[PDB]
């Protein structure tokens, strides 16, 4: 069913507005608690900071705009079900019946696993990592964590865990529908390892640290996904 | 635009050479080049279609 | 290079779609594309003019 370009842009504008309205309304209901929301996010770090160590703000606008930046992305995460539905409704006529049987399970399962990524990272990984990182400084070095740097690190881990949690289930689903077999995944192992570094390079700043902090979660959790593909 | 560093690119080729090997890395780069070639070919033909539709919209809008 | 971020570019297109609309954003992008096309055309012709003048200077300087 061919349609004029404006028809697709009319629909896209309507769906984009519903995404912006959802984010703004959630942001307005949450912007008043920006400092309280930052206390929750920085709670794992504060509990593990050494005696005499406290968080600092090295930027003039950081004390205000870093909590504001945090509650904005919290709004984006909380509005993901609305955003994903608008994405689904825009791409629903494009998908065929056979492609509909795969995208719908992916969209629903991604949302839950992406939240379990934060729950696992916040309640398990953050206490373990912060208790080690904050107490491994060289002698004479005072751990004074910048609030702007901490927010970037936390969202880097939250995005990494949420995305990488979906990889094993996506692999198992692809094995279930028959798109890919465990045998074919084992012979594509060298390419995924190189491909993981390529994906990490593109989606991260040119620092190698950000490349490896992302690529290793994909390739490792790719390997676990192949393991459960046997039990299916 | 994606931010690509020289160190990041060298690591990819270094890892690709030691993992894929002398016989699979050139084919992998050739395959990736074809993907980018097809991506730009698809981008060009769609932009041509959008330009042709915009002219049709102007013809309809001008009359009405 | 002007430093352009993916988030910055998406914001412009998102804001342009909701402000200009489905009927004015494509024309706005088309107009801006023509500006860049004319900008690169102007750069190319002047470089050709500069290259020709440099050849003339060499002829004059070599004789003198």
């Amino acid at each position: 069913d061919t349609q004029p370009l404006i028809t697709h842009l009319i629909e896209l504008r309507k769906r984009l507005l519903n995404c912006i309205i959802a984010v703004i309304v959630i942001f307005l209901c949450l912007v008043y608690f920006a400092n309280d929301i930052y206390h929750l996010v920085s709670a794992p770090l504060i509990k593990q900071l050494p005696q005499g160590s406290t968080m600092i703000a090295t930027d003039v606008a950081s004390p205000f705009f870093t909590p504001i930046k945090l509650t904005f992305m919290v709004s984006l995460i909380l509005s993901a079900p609305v955003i994903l539905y608008q994405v689904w409704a825009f791409i629903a006529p494009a998908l065929y019946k056979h492609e509909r049987r795969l995208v719908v399970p992916l969209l629903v399962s991604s949302s839950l696993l992406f939240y379990i990524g934060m729950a696992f990272a916040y309640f398990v990984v953050f206490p373990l990592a912060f208790g080690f990182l904050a107490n491994t400084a060289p002698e004479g070095v005072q751990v004074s964590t910048d609030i702007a740097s901490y927010l970037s690190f936390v969202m880097a881990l939250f995005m990494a865990f949420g995305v990488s949690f979906e990889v094993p289930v996506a692999i198992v689903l692809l094995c279930w529908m028959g798109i890919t077999s465990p045998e074919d995944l084992r012979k594509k192992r060298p390419y995924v390892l190189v491909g993981a570094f390529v994906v990490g390079m593109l989606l991260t700043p040119p620092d190698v640290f950000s490349q490896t902090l992302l690529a290793i979660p994909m390739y490792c959790l790719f390997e676990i996904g192949v393991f459960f593909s046997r039990f299916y | 635009m994606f931010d690509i560093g020289f160190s990041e690119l060298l690591l990819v080729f270094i890892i690709g050479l030691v993992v894929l090997g002398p016989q699979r890395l050139p084919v992998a780069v050739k395959t990736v080049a074809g993907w980018i070639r097809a991506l730009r070919s698809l981008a060009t033909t769609v932009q041509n279609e959008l330009t042709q539709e915009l002219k049709l919209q102007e013809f309809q809008d001008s009359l009405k | 290079m002007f430093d352009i971020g993916f988030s910055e570019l998406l914001l412009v297109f998102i804001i342009g779609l909701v402000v200009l609309g489905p009927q004015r954003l494509p024309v706005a992008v088309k107009t801006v594309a023509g500006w860049i096309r004319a900008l690169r055309s102007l750069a190319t012709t002047v470089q050709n003019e500069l290259t020709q003048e440099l050849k003339l200077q060499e002829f004059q300087d070599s004789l003198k």
Binding site: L95 | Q47 | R37
Partner: peptide, 27 residues
């Protein structure tokens, strides 16, 4: 133009911009 071709083309243009900048698209 159909919805599938619109989505496919839009992603291709976005991918080109991420690999060659916004000036390449307008070329």
């Amino acid at each position: 133009m159909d919805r599938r071709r619109f989505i496919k083309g839009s992603m291709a243009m976005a991918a080109v911009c991420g690999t060659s900048g916004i000036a390449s698209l307008f070329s």
